[PDB]
Amino acid sequence: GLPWYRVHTVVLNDPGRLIAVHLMHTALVAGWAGSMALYELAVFDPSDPVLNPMWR
Amino acid sequence: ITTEDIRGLTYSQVKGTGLANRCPEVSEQNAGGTIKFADDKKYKVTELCLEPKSFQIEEEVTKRRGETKKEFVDTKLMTRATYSLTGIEGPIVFKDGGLTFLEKGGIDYAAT
Numbered sequence A: 001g002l003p004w005y006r007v008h009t010v011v012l013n014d015p016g017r018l019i020a021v022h023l024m025h026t027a028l029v030a031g032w033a034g035s036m037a038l039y040e041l042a043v044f045d046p047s048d049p050v051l052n053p054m055w056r
Numbered sequence B: 001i002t003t004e005d006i007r008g009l010t011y012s013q014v015k016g017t018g019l020a021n022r023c024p025e026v027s028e029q030n031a032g033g034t035i036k037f038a039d040d041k042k043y044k045v046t047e048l049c050l051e052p053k054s055f056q057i058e059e060e061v062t063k064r065r066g067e068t069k070k071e072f073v074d075t076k077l078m079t080r081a082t083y084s085l086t087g088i089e090g091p092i093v094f095k096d097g098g099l100t101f102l103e104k105g106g107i108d109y110a111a112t
Ligand code: CLA
Pocket: A004, A005, A006, A007, A008, A009
């Protein structure tokens, strides 16, 4: 049938399903942005910006 | 709020309004006086009420484990308004070269 590396080619000629998979990818990326921000805020130390800035 | 105004209000009006925590004040109309301490007359303080309106804490400027520099930062009150002291009274005696007030009663503390 369709090997493991061609599996996302079924949505090649289905524009609605293509919009669906693009939406899912966008959802995952936005969720990553939010989750990364939350984790960073959880582990961030805002006390000392001159000797312990964000990049340290 | 003046003491003359607190007498006018009943407990029902004052309850739940935050006016009980507020320290009174002497009116500008009734001012410019002089509470002279006559000899052969022992005097004392009463109703010494202290309302703190600003709270500041000397916090370290950084979370460094060896931080020695500190500055006064403003704070939010977490307890609701029970912080004002009231009812503080005590004698006025000639302990030393001048008069002195000795605190001996009243609410005189607030665990804020
Ligand atoms: C946004 C860009 C993009 C898009 C939309 C596509 C889309 C496609 N590619 Mg891919 N491709 C891309 C970038 C992209 N590619 C890049 C950068 C490369 C170079 C490495 C390739 C190399 C490549 C090859 C060699 C082939 C495809 C093929 C395909 C088709 C099927 C793939 C499939 O079903 O995989 C299914 C994949 C899996 C079931 C698992 C993959 C797991 C990966 C390797 C590791 C984990 C990835 C991780 C979770 C997320 C990555 C994050 C990202 C920021 C990089 C599909 C049309 C196939 C094709 O043309 O078929 C006709 C094909 O043979 N692509």
